[PDB]
Amino acid sequence: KDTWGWPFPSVGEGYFSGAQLFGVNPGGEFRMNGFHDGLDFGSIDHPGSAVHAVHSGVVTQIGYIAGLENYVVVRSDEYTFVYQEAFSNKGNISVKVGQQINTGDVIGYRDTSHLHLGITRETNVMKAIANSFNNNGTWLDPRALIKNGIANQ
Ligand SMILES: [Zn+2]
């Protein structure tokens, strides 16, 4: 019941650079509006191969949009989770649309320099993605969410 976990559980929370953190941070000025709509887990700072689901849900979408590259969308009762940029091709994704997943289940295998994790209450993922650079409450801080979720389970 509402379990949470980190995507690379041997590292757990670990540490993030200014650029990797959610929101508007020193080091993130290179992005539009200086806003980062997710949390980046680098292969250096958060080592590991298998990307573990941070929360239970159902896989609603697997697609490709340059920038997100290959991505997986998982929807729970309250949240939409986007796992993006980790997978150099769709063959690196382990799950299929319609699949019920539990916290810790492998989404796929990261073979790029990072996973970007995005979390939103928005149900229309494309609309949320249209707000990738807008600090308007669409996207939530995954670090704070996972941390609080783990503490409260
Ligand atoms: Zn990112």
Author numbering: 360 to 512
What does the report in the manuscript say about this coordinate set?
The structure comprises residues 360–512, and residues 338–359 were not visible in the electron density map. The core antiparallel β-sheet anchors the catalytic residues, which bind a central Zn2+. Zn2+ is coordinated by three adjacent residues (His395, Asp399 of the characteristic HxxxD motif and His475 of the HxH motif) and three water molecules (W110, W111 and W119) in a nearly perfect octa-hedral arrangement. Glu444 and His473 interact with the metal ion through the W111 water molecule. CbpA contains a longer L-shaped Loop 1 above the Zn2+, thus forming a lid above the active site that regulates the entrance of the substrate towards the middle of the groove. These different conformations of the loops in CbpA may indicate binding to more diverse substrates compared with lysostaphin. In the active site of CbpA, the corresponding anionic center that coordinates the lysine residues of ENO1 may include Asp396 and Asp399, and the binding of the cationic to the carboxylate moiety of ENO1 may require Arg390.
In the present study, we identified and isolated choline-binding protein A (CbpA) as an S-layer protein of L. salivarius REN that we show is important for adhesion. Here, the results of our in vitro binding and co-immunoprecipitation experiments show that enolase is the CbpA receptor expressed by HT-29 cells.
